[PDB]
Amino acid sequence: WTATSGSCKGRCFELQEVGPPDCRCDNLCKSYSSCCHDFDELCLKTARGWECTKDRCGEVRNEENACHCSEDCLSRGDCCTNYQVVCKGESHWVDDDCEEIKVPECPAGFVRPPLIIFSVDGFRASYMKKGSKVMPNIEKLRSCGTHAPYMRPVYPTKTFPNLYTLATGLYPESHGIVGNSMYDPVFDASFHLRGREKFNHRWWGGQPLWITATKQGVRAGTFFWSVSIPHERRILTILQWLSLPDNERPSVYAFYSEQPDFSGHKYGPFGPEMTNPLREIDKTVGQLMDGLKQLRLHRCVNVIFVGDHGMEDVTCDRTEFLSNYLTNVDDITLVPGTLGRIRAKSINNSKYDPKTIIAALTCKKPDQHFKPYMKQHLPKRLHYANNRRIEDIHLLVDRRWHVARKPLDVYKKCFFQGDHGFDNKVNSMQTVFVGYGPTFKYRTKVPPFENIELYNVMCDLLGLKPAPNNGTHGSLNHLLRTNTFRPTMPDEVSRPNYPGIMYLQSEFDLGCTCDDKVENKLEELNKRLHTKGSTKERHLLYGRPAVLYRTSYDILYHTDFESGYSEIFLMPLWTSYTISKQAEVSSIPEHLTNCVRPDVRVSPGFSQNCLAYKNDKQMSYGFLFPPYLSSSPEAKYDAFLVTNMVPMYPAFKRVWAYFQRVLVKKYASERNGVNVISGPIFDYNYDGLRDTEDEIKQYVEGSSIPVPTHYYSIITSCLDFTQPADKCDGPLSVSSFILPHRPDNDESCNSSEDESKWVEELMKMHTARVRDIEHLTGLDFYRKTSRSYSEILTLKTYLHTYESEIGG
């Protein structure tokens, strides 16, 4: 209940929210059904439209109009945004050639440039080019400001998770909003778009931009709006707020449009009906920019034009039904659409087995338009597992399709032609970023980037200190004219040992054999230089990674590779090696197939042993540096050391073998040599961060040898391919993957065929930022290049998507 007896007289869109049961007058009062009786009357005038006409000029102030053209309106700060235009012979902003804004040009009283966030729902990246002829204002912004060809949302590519990520720089797994619809099992409640649950503050984690602002002395406009409030009043309210006196005027503002998403669902991404929604948006933009020119703020304010996601062609008849795969279709709840999420209908059930549910859903029709995963097995770049609100069973749906439970749900719950929510790397989901203002750069294109990064930047524009988030602060410095944040490499925590020869063959009882006995001052002095690291600057191109936690490890040099070997985990943390274009693939000689040699630099006590592997019929082994790419038959023995060996399921070895034997050489040819760093990853609790010694859930049977949950490689080369990797002057180029270490190849439906038909496809799906691997390993790469640190942060955030050219 609320006594709505109070009044909004002079409180129209007040900024401090008063508490029940007195009536509110802010842009959220509607959604809580708690407005004062006169709110509609006083605060939402509509009379005479939103534009001045000639006859309206100089007029007599009438408080009933929606906006004014009366002489005193500039003073009152409430003119129609075109007042200067029709009444004062002034041109529109869109018509002025754009002048570089070399310094802020702000009126007396503005202690800092304000920031306006203009967010547009469902604004697909390719709109900027395709709809350009009917969006001149937005095309002005793009072309004079700083733009990216596209910006990448988070997964799921849905509205709530994506808007809240903009405001926090957090993955949904961390912020709490993992879907538009969610079930929390500790709350036993459901978050849906309709209804009032989504209002309880308990769903919303992280610290959003406006709280960050308040907590540090910067006042904020309120971000959310109410659906019935038209866009014109939304603009005029933002300009009114900007006319407030210095001590009350917010410094950060938000605008939001339901379009073009609302139509995209109706007409599809490119339906001819779409031109109007776009025309509208552009007009709204024009109205902000004209309004800011009226207030002398158009060369003072920084504007961010940003979308939350894109839009794909989707229709009813492209629905896949679980009822055609399952029998007990009724002992499951499904969260449907462009992503599936499954749980037991009741926890009263002990007969409920996910293993059989997954199997029932795996590669079961040749045509299949989805794929089941357990959430811990989803690609790590999706960062979609570490939250109780994410159900164990996830369905990745194909672009252009839906998953539903039964058919009844689709005709009784065709009307739509567009949707969104697919994998964040799918082209049609990409969205927009343009930045315009004094602090942004002038006529500047920047590379595509992930939206989790904007929070840091928006804090920079405000002089705020960003709350702990998932961006990599400094990775977007190249967007800005001048930045308050000069980033610095983290400090090495653990320094390495450099062990020489300290053990004799006979001290090792490891159960390994090797045919290596057949045995010169000139070529003995030589390989000594290899074990001290005389070819280290060939295989360690960017300096050694740093270890950012306390642990005991040894560096190990060889002719063809070099490693950081963990006495704790009994295997290397990283292994680094350069393969030049000219290098050639040889095969493992018949005699050395089962060769495993002790490493006389490392004690028997801190070594793996062949015995345990023999005893464990589930587990086999692999090597980090591949023997196939040894530079000489002699150097090859180096690859068989007990300290280059890692545990690997037979099924994984297939994957690994073909990566090592075929793809490395291929990349080396296409890229002009590559530098490869490879290693294990342990993330048993799937939080995207390295596990500690005492969080290991799986050892090789009868040993203290941990089993990785994943395998990574980082493949680097010269961005200019005419330069070999090992002699690169300028910028670098990189691609990486985090491969799940799994005992079967159920993920690949063509897996019984030749590796050449399915392995590279899997690797692609599990593409990765170097930054993701840093979280998962606790290492820090690229410590010694010729490149600026900011450039190196940009590079560690890059993700190679394997999607073709945006637009067509």
Ligand X SMILES: *[C@@H]1O[C@H](CO)[C@@H](O[C@@H]2O[C@H](CO)[C@@H](O[C@@H]3O[C@H](CO[C@H]4O[C@H](CO)[C@@H](O)[C@H](O[C@H]5O[C@H](CO)[C@@H](O)[C@H](O)[C@@H]5O[C@H]5O[C@H](CO)[C@@H](O)[C@H](O)[C@@H]5O)[C@@H]4O)[C@@H](O)[C@H](O)[C@@H]3O)[C@H](O)[C@H]2NC(C)=O)[C@H](O)[C@H]1NC(C)=O
Closer by beta carbon to ligand X, 343 or else 369? 343
Handedness of CA 675, 678, 683, 689 (dihedral sign): negative
Beta bridge partners, 68, equal: 79
Q: Where do the H-state alpha helices sit in 482-559?
A: 522-532, 536-539
Residue 159 assigned as binding residue: yes
Q: Which stretch binds ligand Y2Q (CB under 6 A): 250-258, 404-412, 551-559, 788-796?
A: 250-258
Site for Zn ion in 308-327 (CB under 5 A): 308
Shortest Cβ 717–ligand Y2Q spacing (Å): 38
Please answer whether residues 403 and 320 qualify as being in contact, where contact means their C-beta atoms are separated by less than 8 angstroms: yes
Residue 309 assigned as binding residue: yes
CA 456-457-462 angle, to 5 degrees, is 100
613: its two tokens? 């592997």
Closer by beta carbon to ligand Y2Q, 172 or else 647? 172
> Taking CB under 6 A as the rule, does residue 167 contact ligand Y2Q?
yes
- Distance (Å) of CA 379 to CA 154, 371, 684, 739: 13, 12, 14, 8
Q: Which stretch binds ligand X (CB under 6 A): 107-115, 286-294, 312-320, 462-470?
A: 462-470
Please answer whether residues 339 and 393 qualify as being in contact, where contact means their C-beta atoms are separated by less than 8 angstroms: no
Cβ neighbours, 10 Å, residue 45: 17
Please answer whether residues 431 and 261 qualify as being in contact, where contact means their C-beta atoms are separated by less than 8 angstroms: no
Site string for Ca ion, 654-693 (x = CB under 5 A): -----------------------------x-x-x-x-x--
Q: Where do the H-state alpha helices sit in 169-244?
A: 172-175, 209-214, 231-243
Beta bridge partners, 497, equal: 554
Total residues contacting ligand X by CB under 6 A comes to 16
Residue 444 assigned as binding residue: no
Site string for ligand X, 385-414 (x = CB under 6 A): -xx---------------------------
Q: Which residue has the tokens 């906006």?
A: 67
The identity of residue 556, as a single letter, is L
Nearest to 151, CA basis, from 374, 435, 495: 435
Report the distance separating Cα 733 and Cα 614, nearest Å: 41
Active site residue 159: yes
> Taking CB under 5 A as the rule, does residue 772 contact Ca ion?
no
Contacts of 83 (CB under 8 A, 6+ apart): 52, 67, 68, 69, 73, 74, 294
Closer by beta carbon to ligand Y2Q, 361 or else 464? 464
Q: Which stretch binds Zn ion (CB under 5 A): 57-65, 157-165, 477-485, 696-704?
A: 157-165
Please answer whether residues 730 and 719 qualify as being in contact, where contact means their C-beta atoms are separated by less than 8 angstroms: yes
Could you list the beta-strand ranges (E) of 216-331.
Answer: 252-260, 302-307, 312-313, 319-321
Total residues contacting Ca ion by CB under 5 A comes to 5
Cβ neighbours, 10 Å, residue 583: 18
Please answer whether residues 193 and 159 qualify as being in contact, where contact means their C-beta atoms are separated by less than 8 angstroms: no
Closer by beta carbon to ligand Y2Q, 51 or else 258? 258
> Taking CB under 6 A as the rule, does residue 26 contact ligand Y2Q?
no
Among the listed residues 34, 65, 70, 159, the single contact to ligand Y2Q using CB under 6 A: 159
Site string for ligand X, 536-575 (x = CB under 6 A): ----------------------------------------
> Taking CB under 5 A as the rule, does residue 261 contact Zn ion?
yes
Report the distance separating Cα 366 and Cα 797, nearest Å: 36
Q: Which residue has the tokens 């060889």?
A: 558
Catalytic member of 81, 146, 159, 716: 159
Picked from ligand X, Zn ion, ligand Y2Q, none, the partner binding residue 166 (CB below 5 to 8 A depending on kind) is ligand Y2Q
Give contact residues for ligand X (rule: CB under 6 A). 170, 173-176, 205-206, 383, 386-387, 468-470, 688-689, 775
Q: Which residues are annotated as a binding site for 1-hexadecanoyl-sn-glycero-3-phosphate?
A: 159, 180, 261, 420
Give contact residues for ligand Y2Q (rule: CB under 6 A). 117, 119, 121, 159, 163-164, 166-167, 180, 193, 223-225, 254, 256, 258, 261
Q: Which residues are annotated as a binding site?
A: 121, 159, 180, 261, 265, 308-309, 420, 683, 685, 687, 689, 691
Give contact residues for Ca ion (rule: CB under 5 A). 683, 685, 687, 689, 691
